[PDB]
Amino acid sequence: GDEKRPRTAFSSEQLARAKREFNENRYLTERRRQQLSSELGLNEAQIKIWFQNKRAKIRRS
Questions:
Q1: Angle between the 44-54 and 33-40 helix axes, to the nearest 10 degrees?
Q2: Which side of the chain, N or C, has fewer Cβ within a 10 Å radius?
Q3: Residue 3: helix, strand or coil by DSSP?
Q4: Highest CATH level, class, for 1-61
Q5: Angstrom distance (rounded) from CA 27 to CA 7
């Protein structure tokens, strides 16, 4: 994105991941969220529950 980032906390490589990270949880919410909720047989209180658990993927950090 920018043209002047350090090389410790994130040399853009980590900043770019933040995008791709949500990019896989920003559209599906309105692209496939209906497909899941449909085959999942639940409500919004469970939809987020899936991705909410996937957001960690065994890291809780």
A1: 110
A2: C
A3: coil
A4: mainly alpha
A5: 30
